[PDB]
Design a protein around this ligand. Sequence first.
Ligand SMILES: CCCCCCCCCC(=O)OC[C@H]1O[C@H](O[C@H]2O[C@H](CO)[C@@H](O)[C@H](O)[C@H]2O)[C@H](O)[C@@H](O)[C@@H]1O
Length: 173
Amino acid sequence: GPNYTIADYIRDNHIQETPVHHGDPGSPTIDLPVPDDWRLLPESSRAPYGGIVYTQPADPNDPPTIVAILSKLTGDIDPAKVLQFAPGELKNLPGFQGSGDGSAATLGGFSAWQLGGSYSKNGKLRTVAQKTVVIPSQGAVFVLQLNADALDDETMTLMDAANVIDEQTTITP
Ligand SMILES: CCCCCCCCCC(=O)OC[C@H]1O[C@H](O[C@H]2O[C@H](CO)[C@@H](O)[C@H](O)[C@H]2O)[C@H](O)[C@@H](O)[C@@H]1O
């Protein structure tokens, strides 16, 4: 879309991006909680750094989910620029409408950005949110993204899970 994204920032600079998996040497330990009535998703193509799925969806083929992605950035990387461009991806979604560009936050003592809103997919309104955490460590900048998605009517289910994550996540470089 017309908004500059983290993907664009990496593509446009001398920055190498590597996917990161649980237990990789050199990687931060990220302890994300599993809220009650949610279930852990192992790492997979659909949930690169794992995720959680709600166990009482109104539609079993479209349940509330929060998926994690962890990337390792090396090279000519500025951590504050990653936060500056975090809004771009959601803002390019079809029909996205949110409260501004989001806001600054923290997770586990590291700087983060969070934004949320609604978008229309296949004529259905969905709630989406993304928290991006920048974790400078060991000659690199790790970027954690937490991607939340649910049908509009289950917005409050997503919000509850996000509270648990914000309260209880630890990050250890
Ligand atoms: C930790 C995992 C990533 C963060 C998960 C946060 C999940 C909770 C749901 C999310 O925060 O959505 C709520 C935010 O979206 C809102 O959107 C509502 O209000 C806008 C106002 O323009 C409206 O257009 C939209 O249709 C509504 O759903 C707000 O934009 C945010 O400020 C809320 O916090």
